[PDB]
Design a protein around this nucleic acid. Structure first.
Ligand SMILES: Nc1ncnc2c1ncn2[C@H]1C[C@H](O)[C@@H](COP(=O)(O)NP(=O)(O)OP(=O)(O)O)O1
Ligand SMILES: [Mg+2]
Ligand SMILES: [Mg+2]
Length: 431
DNA sequence: ATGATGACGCT
DNA sequence: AGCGTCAT
């Protein structure tokens, strides 16, 4: 009781852009705004693969991974924006540059951990402490939380529209707050939410992009919270909200449990919801899923997690990849060499920009391929030295380290045909 | 015939 | 090192 940790020591937010690549294209092309629209990659195979979808289009059932020709059957008026293609492949530069716009604004408020092209975790523990002193015991107005939901509220003995509900919950939360105790975790979360309102206002003002956010005591809860009221809203998940929230929360919805581990938790334990994990001892969970995973599950199902927000705003690897599906699999040596060069050229461009912007150099080159028949993401990875940002040298070196995979006796050919090439620059050092 | 990426764990 | 998992 007195010595039980409650995982309420930090304030962590997760900020995730709403239909990010779509907003990037809508900002650029006003004709796309407030329309069902999607971002597509490679127009020739069935209109292109959809990689992002506006909320207007989601209402028709359009999803990521859908072929655009198929999406158009669901949504005949769907508008599309195409990803740029350079050197025969998708070029995501526009979206990486937009991401930097957003990450640079977030970084003004606090230390961030870049988690994807469109989201970052924020450790607000310090900013909250300082804001609480300046707020010398002074209450927090609902006007300071105009887009905040309080998960689990309203509740109890007590409107039929969304915003009425939001407000009722926020009112219940604020009315019950203990503002004279600067160490109240619920107060710390609330002030955290005020800061995230400010952050999200800054992003929208300075970029035009809308986003959602979660505010809680750790990364897994903040990420889960972010998604509860997307788009263009933020959600506070308190420690106290966890038992009800988790009581019907499918295990696969929790970060890192969406794959085989989560499926094994479900099968082995015979459970469906996160909250059901509380029934097991830490030793029991470790017995089934290993020391690290077992400890992690034991704490997480109680709303407790210690994974820190890492101070990292920049990616640790820079890579370029291309698939060659079906009949397009590379079958000749000259083919393989041409495409390695295309990849190397793009990688060179990105590395050179990276070294100028960020004062660092990559020192290792990883070359990965996939062969026909293999369902694995990669069939084979080999590394070599990256000593010069030169595309012809990188492409030549990549060929050298993989050319032995050519099981064939031919000279002119390549077998088995290659269904993927991947060049990744790694192991950065200061420069 | 999703694709193009990116982080991190395991042995 | 090279492979596998999980992720957007
Ligand atoms: N499997 C994938 N393959 C290629 N690009 C992808 C991708 N998943 C996402 N992207 C690209 C395209 C996405 O725009 C961007 C962010 O991904 P999200 O945050 O998962 N989804 P969004 O921001 O679109 O919508 P909302 O967050 O409101 O649900 O990353
Ligand atoms: Mg997003
Ligand atoms: Mg995201």
């Amino acid at each position: 009781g007195p010595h039980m940790a409650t995982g309420q020591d930090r304030v962590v937010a997760l900020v995730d852009m709403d239909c990010f690549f779509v907003q990037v294209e809508q900002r650029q092309n006003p004709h796309l705004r407030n329309k069902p629209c999607a971002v597509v990659q490679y127009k020739s195979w069935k209109g292109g693969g959809i990689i992002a979808v506006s909320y207007e289009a989601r209402a028709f059932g359009v999803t990521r991974s859908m072929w655009a020709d198929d999406a158009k059957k669901l949504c005949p008026d769907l508008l599309l924006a195409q990803v740029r293609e350079s050197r025969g492949k998708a070029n995501l530069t526009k979206y990486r540059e937009a991401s930097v716009e957003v990450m640079e604004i977030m970084s003004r408020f606090a230390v961030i951990e870049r988690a994807s092209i469109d989201e970052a975790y924020v450790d607000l523990t310090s900013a909250v402490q300082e804001r609480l002193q300046k707020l010398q015991g002074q209450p927090i107005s609902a006007d300071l939380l105009p887009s905040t939901y309080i998960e689990g509220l309203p509740q109890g003995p007590t409107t039929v529209q969304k915003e009425g509900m939001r407000k009722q919950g926020l009112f219940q939360w604020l009315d019950s707050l203990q503002i004279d105790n600067l160490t109240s975790p619920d107060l710390q979360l609330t002030v955290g939410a005020v800061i995230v309102e400010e952050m999200r206002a800054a992003i929208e003002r300075e970029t035009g992009f809308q986003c959602s956010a979660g505010i809680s005591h750790n990364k897994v809860l903040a990420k889960l919270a972010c998604g509860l009221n997307k788009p263009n809203r933020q959600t506070l998940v308190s420690h106290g909200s966890v038992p009800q929230l988790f009581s019907q929360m499918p295990i696969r919805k929790i970060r890192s449990l969406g794959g085989k581990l989560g499926a094994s938790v479900i099968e082995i334990l015979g459970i469906e919801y996160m909250g059901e994990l509380t029934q097991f001892t830490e030793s029991q969970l470790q017995s089934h899923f290993g020391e690290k995973n077992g400890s992690w599950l034991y704490a997480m199902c109680r709303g407790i997690e210690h994974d820190p927000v890492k101070p990292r705003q920049l990616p640790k690897t820079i890579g370029c990849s291309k698939n060659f599906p079906g009949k397009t699999a590379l079958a000749t040596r000259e083919q393989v060499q041409w495409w390695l060069l295309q990849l190397a050229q793009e990688l060179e461009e990105r590395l050179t920009k990276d070294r100028n912007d960020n004062d660092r150099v990559a020192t290792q080159l990883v070359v990965s391929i996939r062969v026909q028949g293999d369902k694995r993401l990669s069939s084979l990875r080999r590394c070599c030295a990256l000593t010069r940002y030169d595309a012809h040298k990188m492409s030549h070196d990549a060929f050298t380290v993989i050319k032995n995979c050519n099981t064939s006796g031919i000279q002119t050919e390549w077998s088995p045909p290659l269904t993927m090439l991947f060049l990744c620059a790694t192991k950065f050092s200061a420069s």
